[PDB]
From Swiss-Prot:
Post-translational modification: Polyubiquitinated by PRKN, which leads to proteasomal degradation. The inner channel of the NPC has a different redox environment from the cytoplasm and allows the formation of interchain disulfide bonds between some nucleoporins, the significant increase of these linkages upon oxidative stress reduces the permeability of the NPC.
Function: E3 SUMO-protein ligase which facilitates SUMO1 and SUMO2 conjugation by UBE2I. Involved in transport factor (Ran-GTP, karyopherin)-mediated protein import via the F-G repeat-containing domain which acts as a docking site for substrates. Binds single-stranded RNA (in vitro). May bind DNA. Component of the nuclear export pathway. Specific docking site for the nuclear export factor exportin-1. Inhibits EIF4E-dependent mRNA export. Sumoylates PML at 'Lys-490' which is essential for the proper assembly of PML-NB.
Coiled coil ranges: none
Origin: domain of life: Eukaryota
Entry note about domains: Contains FG repeats. FG repeats are interaction sites for karyopherins (importins, exportins) and form probably an affinity gradient, guiding the transport proteins unidirectionally with their cargo through the NPC. FG repeat regions are highly flexible and lack ordered secondary structure. The overall conservation of FG repeats regarding exact sequence, spacing, and repeat unit length is limited. The PPIase cyclophilin-type domain has high structural similarity with PPIA, but has extremely low and barely detectable proline isomerase activity (in vitro). Only about half of the residues that surround the PPIA active site cleft are conserved.
Signal sequence extent: none
Domain RanBD1: from-to ranges: 1-122
Source organism per UniProt: Homo sapiens (Human)
Protein name from the UniProt record: E3 SUMO-protein ligase RanBP2
Length: 124
């Protein structure tokens, strides 16, 4: 509902993890559709993801030109990046990992994500 002014560039099922910098492991953060959104008039891009049943936000942040989306080492399903994220009600720098059903979807997510970033530079 709070996405009225944004076109959906990507929307697929995913599992999202956050790096716990103590127990040194990935802790599950949510399961549901993850989106890449584009605010038409204000010209910015955003990641947004709500959990399946409860509909709590598990990721929400603007895409920046310095973010680096790489694979989780040799994986074909999982991608990894650092974002200053708002899910907990304030901006916190988190290390995120998102894993898709197929290799194909993951590739598409990467490609779209990178497309958005390029547009960021085309206007700088």
């Amino acid at each position: 509902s709070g996405e009225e002014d944004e076109e959906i560039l990507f929307k697929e099922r995913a599992k999202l993890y956050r790096w716990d910098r103590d127990v040194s492991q990935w802790k599950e953060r949510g399961v549901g559709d993850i989106k890449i959104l584009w605010h038409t008039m204000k010209n910015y891009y955003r990641i947004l993801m709500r959990r399946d049943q409860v509909f709590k936000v598990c990721a929400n942040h603007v895409i920046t030109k310095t973010m680096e989306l790489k694979p989780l080492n040799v994986s074909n399903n999982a991608l990894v990046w650092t974002a200053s994220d708002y899910a907990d009600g304030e901006a916190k720098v988190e290390q995120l990992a998102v894993r898709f059903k197929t290799k194909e979807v993951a590739d598409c997510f990467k490609k779209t994500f990178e497309e958005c970033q390029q547009n960021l530079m085309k206007l700088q």
